Amino acid sequence: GSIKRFRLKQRLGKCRRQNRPVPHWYRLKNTKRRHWRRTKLGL
Amino acid sequence: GRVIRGQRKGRGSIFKSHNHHRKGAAKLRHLDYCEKKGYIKGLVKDIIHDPGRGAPLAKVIFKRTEKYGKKEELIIASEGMFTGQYISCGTKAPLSVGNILPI
């Protein structure tokens, strides 16, 4: 909801941050990826 | 078999008394030297309804003798007693309706 606790909001931010692809310069040498509608955080 | 309703009653989960709006326990004055050898008169200020019971309660204000101040008692009102009436409690209280006397 719009109403959130600080820890919950920080967790949401971390979950969003962990949802980005592997950088290309690293691929020059990810499976833990989720969509908001398919797999719910549950946390 | 299973536990019957009468047995469930004593667990006191949903069978506790509904007492949210009760006005207080109906008890007369605690025994005191004034009641042992005399009279102390309290003024009944209001007659209220206790939702649990059918008998009306009387709020009686006594003037404390040990210290300056007043104490409120919730007595069970007897028929014919009215707000603004002084009731006497003690050994020497006159025998009249509403007074508290030794039997």
Partner: protein
């Protein structure tokens, strides 16, 4: 009827009973009775049971960082006196 035994009643599924449990970090903290179903956080102890080898082994010692005991490991084969340093070049 309409909020029947299945899909209709599932429609009313909001209002969680468990949350994050600051001790475990796992969503097993019962909000009404303020107690974690996984570790029993308000209790001092950890709430382990011998009838769950899986549950024991997925949160035993060594499943995390071991920040301090792994440091104190290997001290036994060195036996350096505390405060000692190697001799300078």
């Amino acid at each position: 009827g309409k909020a029947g035994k299945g899909t209709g009643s599932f429609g009313k599924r909001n209002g969680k009973t468990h949350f994050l449990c600051l001790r475990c970090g796992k969503r097993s903290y019962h909000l009404q009775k303020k107690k974690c179903a996984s570790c029993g956080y308000p209790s001092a102890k950890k709430r382990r049971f011998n009838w769950s080898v899986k549950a024991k082994r997925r949160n035993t010692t060594g499943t995390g960082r071991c920040r301090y005991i792994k440091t104190l490991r290997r001290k036994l084969k060195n036996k350096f006196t505390e405060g000692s340093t190697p001799k300078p070049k």
